[PDB]
Design a protein around this motif. Structure first.
Motif, short mmCIF file in Angstrom:
data_model
loop_
_atom_site.label_atom_id
_atom_site.label_comp_id
_atom_site.label_asym_id
_atom_site.label_seq_id
_atom_site.Cartn_x
_atom_site.Cartn_y
_atom_site.Cartn_z
N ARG A 185 6.46 -15.39 -6.46
CA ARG A 185 6.05 -15.27 -7.85
C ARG A 185 5.04 -14.14 -7.98
O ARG A 185 4.12 -14.03 -7.16
N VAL A 186 5.21 -13.32 -9.02
CA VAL A 186 4.36 -12.16 -9.26
C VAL A 186 3.93 -12.18 -10.72
O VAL A 186 4.77 -12.36 -11.62
N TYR A 197 13.31 -9.44 0.39
CA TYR A 197 12.99 -10.24 1.57
C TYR A 197 13.08 -11.74 1.31
O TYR A 197 12.45 -12.53 2.02
N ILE A 198 13.85 -12.14 0.30
CA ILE A 198 13.95 -13.54 -0.11
C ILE A 198 15.33 -14.06 0.26
O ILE A 198 16.35 -13.40 0.00
N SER A 199 15.37 -15.24 0.87
CA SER A 199 16.61 -15.94 1.20
C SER A 199 16.52 -17.32 0.55
O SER A 199 16.09 -18.29 1.17
N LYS A 211 0.83 -1.20 0.00
CA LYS A 211 0.00 0.00 0.00
C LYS A 211 0.87 1.26 0.00
O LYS A 211 0.80 2.08 -0.93
N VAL A 212 1.72 1.40 1.02
CA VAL A 212 2.54 2.60 1.16
C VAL A 212 3.34 2.86 -0.12
O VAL A 212 3.20 3.90 -0.76
N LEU A 213 4.18 1.89 -0.51
CA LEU A 213 5.13 2.12 -1.60
C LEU A 213 4.45 2.33 -2.95
O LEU A 213 4.96 3.07 -3.79
N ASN A 261 9.11 -7.61 -9.01
CA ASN A 261 10.05 -8.70 -8.78
C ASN A 261 11.29 -8.21 -8.04
O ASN A 261 11.66 -8.75 -6.99
N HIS A 262 11.93 -7.16 -8.57
CA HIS A 262 13.12 -6.61 -7.93
C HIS A 262 12.86 -6.21 -6.48
O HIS A 262 13.75 -6.34 -5.63
N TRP A 263 11.65 -5.74 -6.17
CA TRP A 263 11.34 -5.33 -4.81
C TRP A 263 11.14 -6.53 -3.90
O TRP A 263 11.70 -6.59 -2.80
#
Lengths: 135, 414, 82
Positions: free
Chosen positions: B391-392, B370-372, B343-345, B364-366
């Motif tokens: 996945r987006v 938070y992915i490990s 929402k914010v971004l 995807n880049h965003w």
């Protein structure tokens, strides 16, 4: 983005007539919690069984006031209930007399001062005077 | 002579303590006190330097029902006004992370309806609602009767729990979380362990453990969420004695038993593993007491929602896995943080020259942040990166110029 | 042990896993009651519940009006004497 939590609950002794949205929330932190209590203004009007005598029909109504958590301690509770505060003053008088810290004339004057409180019951006054050594 | 005066002081203090016990054991006094003291117990265990914030909203359950029933729709309730409208749905504002309600719930219809409204609001704002359950919910006078309950699952089959049974099946139940036994907040007054000034007060707890200043465990759970966020900026590590679901430093109270000594359990009962498992199957968050210590633990934080069963085929078992993931608060929190960030971004990106594929690439880049996805990231280090895969997909709604339909699916660490 | 005894079932399927014996038993009370009895006996033998709870649950299982008295007797014959 910060992690903001909303604590909703009955923090007062009575409901407010203010519409639920109209009333505002209060930001709380370690550097102002007590100030938040004092500004919120705590009050409890309640009746408990009067165990200072031997009458089941005897009841005691108290109006306690809170500005900080320390006000929940028994010392504050006694300070805010004259039926007990007079008994604590009597305690101090008896300990002072028994420890020889004051003479009998001073003891008598202070005793009169303690028992003069018009909010006290005569039965309580008699129970307090019964604790005075005969000498 | 002085010995007699000392006896007078003993009797005087005896009577005074007799009355003081009536004051300190009054239900109204204990309501106020436990409210404020539990509040401070929560606040002083957080870290406001770690971007943690807390607001107080004075409201009783009866007035919550009054507002929700008075309003024609939840979007016009005051609570919704101050939770969603003034926060998550306000450009320049901030969204509420979670809502902690200092209330006990029974099977009563009013309590059930209140839970329904809270589930709706929590779903709309992406923030869970945490509270506590009263002992009579289990048909017992007090939590001390929990070991006598032979079968909670069978207990919940009675018609008295019909409304609760449907509530567990609502899709908004994922935003509801109720805790079990309460926990001690204050050790009883004593000349050695907890003395007071002047008056020699020795608090006398009778046979009724209700004389003890019990406190709502929802605050302890809230401390768990706070610690997880203070360390990692995410709230998944709150379900283990070592993971971060352990509550340490509980009050103790040793007193005489049948000639020996024993400590009043910080929780009403010492829950066994089987009983805790049953409560977890019933969608309750039971704070278990570590025997012989001053530590408790939340072994799991399941929501009220009951999991659905599917056909035992590959696709059906996949559906079961996804659904249960939804039923668990430790993952629901990741989902909620993601929604707030989105929402914010995205609000800030409104107006930019964005084609569908542009949305795909940027999102995807965003999400990768938070992915490990390593072969073996440091344990409790995928804490800061709770996602393993994501996945987006972005399509265009057809009929107008420049809005899209986005689908985001995530596989977090187990 | 009756060759004239027949059992009519009405199974319902929404997914392939509904073809598993667990679902089949779930949909046939003459077997589902026997599975509940199995769970009761395993719980009792593993000491997971006391005799009063065991008795109550047993009454619950055998109360089903769709069961045959012969089946009820065969189920009660599996209860340990103690």
């Amino acid at each position: 983005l910060p992690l903001k939590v909303l604590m909703l609950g009955d923090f007062t002794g009575q409901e407010d007539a203010r519409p639920l949205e109209q009333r505002a929330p209060i930001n709380v932190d370690k550097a102002n919690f007590n100030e938040v209590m004092a500004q919120q203004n705590l009050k409890v009007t309640l009746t408990a069984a009067d165990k200072l005598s031997a009458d089941p029909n005897a009841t005691m109504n108290v109006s306690l006031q809170f500005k900080n958590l320390n006000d929940f301690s028994p010392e504050s509770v006694v300070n805010q209930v004259p039926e007990l505060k007079k008994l604590l003053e009597l305690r101090s008088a008896l300990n002072a007399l028994k420890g020889p810290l004051g003479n009998l004339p001073a003891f008598r004057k202070k005793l009169q001062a303690l028992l003069a409180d018009e909010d006290g019951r005569k039965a309580l006054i008699k129970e307090l005077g019964l604790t005075e050594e005969t000498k | 002579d002085k010995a007699l005066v000392d006896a007078m002081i003993a009797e005087i203090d005896k009577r005074l303590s007799s009355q003081v016990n009536e004051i300190l054991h009054a239900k109204e006094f204990q309501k106020l006190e436990s409210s404020w003291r539990s509040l401070k117990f929560m606040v002083d265990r957080t870290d406001f330097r770690e971007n943690t914030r807390v607001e107080m909203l004075n409201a009783s359950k009866e007035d919550l029902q009054k507002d929700f029933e008075d309003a024609p729709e939840v979007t016009k309730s005051g609570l919704y006004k101050l939770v969603y409208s003034n926060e998550y749905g306000v450009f320049g504002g901030k969204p509420y992370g979670i809502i902690s309600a200092n209330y006990d719930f029974n099977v009563g219809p009013q309590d059930m309806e209140l839970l329904r409204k809270c589930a709706s609001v929590a779903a709309m704002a992406h923030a869970p609602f945490i509270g506590n359950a009263a002992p009579e919910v289990f048909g017992e006078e007090s939590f001390l009767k929990l070991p006598d309950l032979k079968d909670l699952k069978s207990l919940f089959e009675g018609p008295q729990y019909a409304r609760w049974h449907s509530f567990r099946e609502s899709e908004d139940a994922r935003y509801v979380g109720l805790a079990l036994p309460r926990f001690l907040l204050r050790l009883p007054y004593g000349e050695k362990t907890v003395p007071v000034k002047a008056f020699n007060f020795t608090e006398d707890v009778v046979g009724h453990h209700e004389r003890y200043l019990w406190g709502h465990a929802s605050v302890a759970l809230t401390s768990r969420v706070a610690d997880s966020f203070a360390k990692f900026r995410w709230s998944p590590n709150i379900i283990g004695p070592q993971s971060g679901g352990a509550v340490e430093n509980l009050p103790l109270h040793q007193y005489e038993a049948m000639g020996e000594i024993q400590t009043k359990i910080p929780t009403e009962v010492m829950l066994t593993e089987r009983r805790e498992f049953e409560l977890s199957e019933e969608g309750f968050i039971g704070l278990v007491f570590r025997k012989d210590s001053d530590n408790a633990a939340f072994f799991s934080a399941n929501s009220t929602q009951k999991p659905r069963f599917f056909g035992n085929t590959p696709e059906g078992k996949a559906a079961e896995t996804n659904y249960r993931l939804g039923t668990q608060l430790p993952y629901m929190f990741i989902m909620t943080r993601l929604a707030h960030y989105i929402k914010v971004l995205q609000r800030e990106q409104i107006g930019s020259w964005k084609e569908k594929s542009d949305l795909e690439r940027e999102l995807n880049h965003w999400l990768s942040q938070y992915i490990s996805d390593m072969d073996d990231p440091a344990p409790a280090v995928r804490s800061r990166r709770p996602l393993r895969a994501a996945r987006v997909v972005v399509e265009d709604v057809e009929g107008q110029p420049g809005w899209y339909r986005c689908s985001l699916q995530v596989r977090p660490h187990f």
